[PDB]
Structures are given as structure tokens and as C-alpha cells.
């Protein structure tokens, strides 16, 4: 969740590898936006009785609520598609299992997650922790030895018009925003935030809970920002300014780490293998959070209750189908399945407004929210974000079609 999701990796790394440091601003303005939007959901969770799905359902009739539920469920399926592609690529790099077979393997990683469960949570998550830290150390090493120009990075943080001019920078930009502001984290946070310690009617107990939840929500989002910048700089350092126009996917990073001159041959192979294991670990951890979010969305909109293993199997089954169809059409082209990997996050950008608007409506309401209320500052910046985001989505959809 955040810096572990493969969508952030592919969008940031391809943004840097294809358009230099330009999209850095899109990483910042989105990472800030999330910090605000999450902070609203937190309040919506703690101030009002229950989470976002129940509120949106409460303000809508059953048909339109079913439509919203279709949009949200499709977003969850999109993230699942992202980590399905991630795990498939990892199994192709480590064990040589083709993508069409690995995608089929990703249906039973629940079983495999039980097998890991038998080995204890703390130990395996510590192994994955040292793995992620080691891989990040490799990336910091690559950026450090690339001799980057700091003034060009800080120049990259400055916005440019070209971000909306051509379809490429705008496409990767929508992918970055959709990957950093995941719509399912709003429904998830708006309910998991209500498990803290406070009396439902005593109010500074609540404001204390929102103080904490907001502080944490900004901490991990800060880390996700830093990691996203480190990855965009990684792809920009390895594949930008190249005569062959390497798009900068997971395979390009794999062979770039494996053929790095100073990094050696066997050592570089160790680095690349660790990166692949970190990609599989990236594809294994998002599933539980996706399952809880799907429970909140389904029980909130449709008021239907099914077990978490069942909806996990259903969401995974629906997620593998477009991956398999993509692999059959393009004959297992890795660059194409990575293009699908980006398109999933772009679809998250498409699905963002349907979750942002009811959040604004419920948060601005005086009766529902009471003392905790959207300061008109929040209403201004938030309505600005909804307007400009929906405008960018409609603009891209109309331009491409």
C-alpha cells in the first residue's frame, strides 16, 4: 500500500525514463492532494457514524448507487490487475514461468499466503522489510553513481504546460495521480479509522483520534512521495536520453541492474534477483487491504455480505481475465502487459471523481459533520481538484477517441 504497489513503480519509473524530471510536479501535487483527501475521509469516519460507502449509498437511490458500486468495484479490480501483472512478471524473471501461466498461478496465491502464514507474520515481514530496504539501497546507489543534476530535478518540480499538451505526459500523469490517490483507500480509511479509542459522542477524544490518524496518514504518504521521486529519478537516470527510447519497464530495470558496469556481473545479478523478489512481495501484500476495501464498498453500497476469501477469489478471477486476454492478443508481449499495468492506474484516475464528489458533499454538510467540518480552505482546494481532475479525464478520453 503506497510505496509497495507496483503501479506507483511502473508509472513513476516510466515517467522518468520517458519524459525526464517533468512529471516530478505531478508526483508532488498528487502526494499533497492525497494527504488532504485522506485527511477528509478520516474526519468523515470519526465525525459521522460510518464510512464513505454507506454515506454515498444513503444519499443515492439503489440504481445510481449500483452504478457507483460498479465504478468502485472496477477500481479495486484495476488494482488487483496491477499486482497480478506484477506477480506474473516476477515469476517470469525468477523462475522462468511465462506470463500466461503465472497469471493463472495468481488465482491460488491465497493458498500460498496461508503457507506463508504458517511461517509467522513477523519473521517473513522482516525478511520482506530487509528486502525492500536493500532494493531501495540499490536504487539510491544507481541514482548516486549516475551523477544527477540537482538543479534539473528542482526544475522538474516546477510545473509546465506540456504536461497537458501531449497525450504521453498527460497519460503517465493520470497514471501517477491514480496510483498515488487510490479510490479504494478512501472507503478503506473511512472505516478502519473508526477502530481507534474514543467515545462516539465525546468530541475532543475524536479530535485527538483525527489528530493521530492525520499524522500517520501524512507520514506514510510522505514516504510514498519520497519513494516515487527516487523511482522517477531512477528511470530518468537509466533510460532517459537514450537513442533507443527504452520505455523503462520492470524488464528494462532488471537488465539494467543486471548489466550495470560498476555493479559487476554476479553482484548485479544478485541485485536484479532481489528486485524481482521485491516485485513479487509487492504483489503479495496489497491483497488483504484490497479485500477489506472491497468488503467496505460492497457492504456499503449493495448491503451484501460475503466472506473475504470468496470475494478475494472473485476479484482475482475477474482481474486475471483481462491480463490473459491481453497476453493472448499480443502473444505474451511484456511491453504490452506493462502498458495494461499503466492503464489500470489511469483507470483509477478515471474512477477518482465518483469517490471524491460524495466525500466533498458529506464533509461540507453541517448536520452530518457538526464541529468537525471542511474549513472553506479545504472546500476551495478540494473542489478545485475535483474540477481540474474531471476536466483532465474527460479531455484525455475525448482526445484519444
Amino acid at each position: 500500500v503506497g510505496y509497495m504497489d507496483p503501479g506507483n513503480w511502473i508509472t513513476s519509473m516510466q515517467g522518468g525514463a520517458q519524459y525526464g524530471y517533468t512529471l516530478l510536479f505531478v508526483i508532488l501535487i498528487s502526494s499533497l492532494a492525497a494527504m488532504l483527501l485522506q485527511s477528509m475521509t478520516v474526519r468523515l469516519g470519526i465525525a459521522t457514524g460510518k464510512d464513505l460507502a454507506q454515506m454515498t449509498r444513503h444519499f443515492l437511490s439503489k440504481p445510481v448507487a449500483i452504478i457507483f458500486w460498479i465504478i468502485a468495484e472496477l477500481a479495486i479490480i484495476a488494482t488487483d490487475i496491477a499486482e497480478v501483472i506484477g506477480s506474473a512478471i516476477a515469476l517470469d524473471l525468477i523462475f522462468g514461468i511465462p506470463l500466461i501461466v503465472g497469471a493463472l498461478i495468481t488465482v491460488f496465491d491465497v493458498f500460498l499466503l496461508l503457507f506463508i502464514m504458517r511461517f509467522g507474520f513477523r519473521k517473513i515481514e522482516a525478511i520482506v522489510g530487509t528486502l525492500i530496504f536493500t532494493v531501495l539501497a540499490i536504487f539510491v546507489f544507481e541514482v548516486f553513481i549516475s551523477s544527477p543534476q540537482l538543479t534539473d530535478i528542482l526544475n522538474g518540480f516546477v510545473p509546465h504546460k506540456e504536461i497537458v499538451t501531449n497525450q504521453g505526459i498527460l497519460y503517465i500523469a493520470l497514471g501517477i495521480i491514480g496510483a498515488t490517490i487510490m479510490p479504494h483507500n478512501l472507503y478503506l480509511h473511512s472505516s478502519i479509522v473508526q477502530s481507534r479509542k474514543y467515545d462516539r459522542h465525546d468530541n475532543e477524544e475524536k479530535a485527538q483520534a483525527i489528530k493521530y490518524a492525520t499524522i500517520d496518514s501524512n507520514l506514510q504518504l510522505s514516504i510514498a512521495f519520497v519513494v516515487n521521486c527516487l523511482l522517477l529519478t531512477l528511470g530518468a537516470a537509466l533510460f532517459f536520453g537514450t537513442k533507443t527510447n527504452d520505455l523503462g519497464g520492470f524488464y528494462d530495470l532488471y537488465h539494467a541492474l543486471k548489466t550495470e558496469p560498476v555493479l559487476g556481473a554476479t553482484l548485479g545479478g544478485v541485485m536484479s534477483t532481489l528486485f524481482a523478489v521485491a516485485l513479487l512481495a509487492s504483489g503479495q501484500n496489497s491483497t488483504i487491504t484490497g479485500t477489506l476495501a472491497g468488503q467496505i464498498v460492497m457492504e456499503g453500497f449493495l448491503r451484501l455480505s460475503i466472506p473475504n476469501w470468496l470475494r478475494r477469489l472473485i476479484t482475482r478471477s475477474l482481474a486475471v481475465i483481462p491480463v490473459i486476454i491481453c497476453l493472448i492478443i499480443f502473444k505474451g508481449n511484456s511491453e504490452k502487459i506493462e502498458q495494461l499495468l499503466v492503464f489500470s492506474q489511469v483507470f483509477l484516475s478515471i474512477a477518482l471523481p465518483f469517490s471524491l464528489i460524495p466525500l466533498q458533499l458529506a464533509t461540507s454538510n453541517k448536520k452530518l459533520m457538526g464541529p468537525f467540518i471542511n474549513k472553506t480552505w479545504v472546500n476551495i482546494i478540494s473542489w478545485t481538484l475535483i474540477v481540474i481532475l474531471s476536466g483532465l479525464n474527460v479531455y484525455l478520453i475525448i482526445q484519444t477517441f
Partner: nanobody
Amino acid sequence: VQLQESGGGLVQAGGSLRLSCAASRSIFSIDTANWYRQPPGMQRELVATITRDGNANYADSVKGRFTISRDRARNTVYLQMNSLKPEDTGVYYCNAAIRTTVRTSAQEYWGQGTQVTVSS
């Protein structure tokens, strides 16, 4: 860095083989690949061609039966030869444009051909 071929050998008409074209050391990318062959007493004939974007083309004598492909995880160009005929017998060569690192210029490489014999 040398281009190494494998997967050839002896097979009966109707069977299948799979040629493997790899490199001696770790490579970043094989941008373009061509599978040539030479039958006894005939000229060197271009059989398969795969490009950077993944598109491929085959000779009319081999189209529909042969399939060149790129394994990107291992940087290995494969030639899947199905429904083999006795005239497919010959020495198969692999020509490939290897890119040692990311920013190195793409270089041309050939390789010692492998023997393919379709008997009876």
C-alpha cells in the same frame, strides 16, 4: 561476448524443434534478430525476423509453421519449428543486434550455426 545457439538436432518429419539463441554473458537487450538457414547444396536463406517492437516475419516456405520470439527475461531469441519437412534440413544461423548496456550502441553479432536434420 559470443552468440550461442542450441536446441537443434535430429527429428522425424512431422515433429518439432525449438532453437535457442542466447549470449555468452549478461546482455541488456537484443533489439533485432534474424534466423538464417542453409540446406546442403543451396544458398543461405533468411527464415525468421523479429524486430524491437515484437513484430515478426517469416519466409513463405516457413510461414505458418515457424515462429520466432523474444524471451525478454532471459534475452533469448527462440525459433519454434513445427511440422518439420525434410527440406528444412540444414545449418541454422542466428544473427542478432546485441546491446551490451543500456546506452551502448547496438552491435551486430553472428554465431556458429547448429545442425538440424529432419529424417525420412
